[PDB]
C-alpha cells in the first residue's frame, strides 16, 4: 500500500526513537545528487539518515503523540526538509564528524536535535563549569 | 451545473479606498485613482470591512463563473497600480542599423518616435497613452521604460511600441530587430 508506505515511514521512525537515546535533526533542505550519501555508510555505525516526502514526514509525527511527547519540540523544525541522524554521543564532536563531508558555498545542517534542546551544538559538558561555578554564582553573588 | 454560490476575495491594503456602485468601480490610493466599468458582467460586490471586499456569482454556470476570478484580478491590479504602480521595460534589439528612439509632440500630444528601424527612411509614431509616462534608462543601453497606475494602459502602450516594429518580408528568425518587453513589474518596491 501507499498508506502502508505512509505507515511504513511511521513504523520505522518510531522504532528509531525507541532505538536511540539521542537524535540529531540535521537540516537536509536542498542538497541532492551523489556525494554525502556515500560517506554515510561509513557513518552508519552511528546513525540512520532518512530523506523523505514532507507531508508524510509530518504525519509520522502525528502518529507519535501517543508517547514520548518530547518529540513535539522537534515539530517547529519539521519545516522544509530535515533529516535524521539517530544517535548516541558525542553531540558536539561526533556530530562534527558527521557534519564534515565537504561544504558547499556546512553541508548543510541548520537545525539541531538534542533531546528537548536545540544547541549550536557546541556546549553540553566539558568541565562541569556550569555546575560548580554557575550553579552557585548568585550564591556567589549573595551567600 | 449551476453553482449555487461561488465567490472570490479582494484584499484592500492600507491607504486605499475602493468604492463600487452599479458595477462602476473607483479605486483610490497614494499613487492616484483609477475607475473601471464592470457592467458587462453580473457579479455582486460586498464589503466585509475596509480591508476586504468579496465578489460572488449566484447560481452560475461555468462560463459565468470564469468571469468571477477575472473580475477579482482586474480589481486587484487597480489596487496594485495605485499603490506600487506599474513599470514595464523594453529593449531595442538590432543587428546593424541602430534604432533611434525619441519623444516628440504635436498639439501638445506626445508620441514615441522611432527612426532608422532596419534602416528605414520612414518614421514610426506611437501615441503615448494618457497616464503612462516614458523614461529612458541611464545605465542600461537601449532601454525605454513605461510606467503608470494602469497596467492596462502601460502594457498596451508597450505593445503598441513593439508592434510598430515588425519586420515585413524577411525571415523573422534571422532578422530579429525590434523593441521588446524585457521586464515587467512595479514602480515602488525594488526592481
Amino acid at each position: 500500500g501507499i498508506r502502508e508506505k505512509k505507515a511504513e515511514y511511521f513504523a520505522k521512525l518510531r522504532e528509531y526513537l525507541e532505538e536511540y537515546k539521542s537524535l540529531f535533526v540535521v537540516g537536509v533542505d536542498n542538497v541532492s545528487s551523489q556525494q554525502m550519501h556515500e560517506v554515510r555508510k561509513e557513518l552508519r555505525g552511528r546513525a540512520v539518515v532518512l530523506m523523505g516526502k514532507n507531508t508524510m514526514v509530518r504525519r509520522a509525527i502525528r502518529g507519535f503523540l501517543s508517547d514520548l511527547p518530547d518529540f513535539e519540540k522537534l515539530l517547529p523544525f519539521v519545516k522544509g526538509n530535515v533529516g535524521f541522524v539517530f544517535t548516541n554521543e558525542p553531540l558536539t564532536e561526533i556530530k562534527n564528524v558527521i557534519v564534515s563531508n565537504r561544504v558547499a558555498a556546512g553541508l548543510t545542517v541548520v537545525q539541531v536535535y538534542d533531546n528537548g534542546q536545540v544547541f549550536p551544538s557546541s556546549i553540553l559538558d566539558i568541565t562541569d563549569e556550569e555546575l560548580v561555578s554557575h550553579f552557585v554564582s548568585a550564591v556567589s553573588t549573595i551567600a | 451545473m449551476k453553482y449555487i454560490q461561488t465567490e472570490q476575495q479582494i484584499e484592500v491594503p492600507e491607504g486605499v479606498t475602493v468604492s463600487i456602485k452599479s458595477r462602476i468601480v473607483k479605486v483610490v490610493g497614494p499613487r492616484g485613482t483609477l475607475t473601471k466599468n464592470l457592467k458587462h458582467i453580473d457579479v455582486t460586490f460586498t464589503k466585509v470591512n475596509n480591508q476586504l471586499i468579496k465578489v460572488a456569482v449566484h447560481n452560475g454556470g461555468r462560463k459565468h463563473v470564469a468571469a468571477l476570478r477575472t473580475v477579482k484580478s482586474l480589481v486587484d491590479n487597480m489596487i496594485t497600480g495605485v499603490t506600487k504602480g506599474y513599470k514595464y521595460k523594453m529593449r531595442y534589439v538590432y543587428a546593424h542599423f541602430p534604432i533611434n528612439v525619441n519623444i516628440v509632440e504635436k498639439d501638445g500630444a506626445k508620441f514615441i518616435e522611432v527612426r532608422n528601424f532596419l534602416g528605414d527612411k520612414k518614421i514610426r509614431n506611437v501615441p503615448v497613452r494618457d497616464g503612462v509616462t516614458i523614461e529612458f534608462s541611464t545605465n542600461v543601453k537601449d532601454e525605454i521604460v513605461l510606467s503608470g497606475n494602469s497596467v492596462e494602459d502601460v502594457s498596451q502602450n508597450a505593445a503598441d511600441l513593439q508592434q510598430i516594429c515588425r519586420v515585413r518580408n524577411k525571415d523573422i528568425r534571422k532578422f530579429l530587430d525590434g523593441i521588446y518587453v524585457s521586464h515587467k513589474g512595479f514602480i515602488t518596491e525594488d526592481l
Binding site: - | 451545473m1 453553482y3 449555487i4 449566484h58
Partner: protein, 172 residues
Amino acid sequence: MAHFKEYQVIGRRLPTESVPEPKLFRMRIFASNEVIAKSRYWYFLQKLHKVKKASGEIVSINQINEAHPTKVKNFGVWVRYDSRSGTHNMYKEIRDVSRVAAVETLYQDMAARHRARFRSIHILKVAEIEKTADVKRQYVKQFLTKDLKFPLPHRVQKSTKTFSYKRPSTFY
C-alpha cells in the same frame, strides 16, 4: 409515460396439473395508469423468464404510495439506456419528496441530456440514500450544506396587460 404512479405488479405462470401453484414474481413499475403498468410487467418478465402473457396471469396490481411524502430525500437512481450508438448503464442522483417525483425528473433529464425517449430507458434501481455523504454527486451535495441560503437575482414578473405605464424592475 407521464405523471407517474408506482405500482406493485405481481404475476405468475398459469397453473398446470403438473405444477399447480407456480412461483409468484413481483416488480415495482413506474407508469401513469395500470394498463401501462401491466404491459410493462410483461415486457420485463419476458426478458427474464420464459413467459408470454398468453401463458401467464397477473395476480395482483397495487399502487404503492410514498411513505413520507413531505420528507425531502436524496435518491440514488440506476438506469440502463440506449443511445443512437449503443447501450449504457448510468448512476444519477435526484433530490425530491417522493420516488414518483424523482422518477419523473429522471425521465425528463434523460430526454434533455441524452435525448433518450421513454422506450429507451430501463429503471434499474431507485433508492433513498441513507447517510448524507454517501451522496456522490456534486449537484445534489451543494444543497446539503449547513444553513443554506441563496437569493434569486433578476426577478421577472409576468404582466397581465399589454402596456405598462412604468418601466419595470427586477428587484426581488
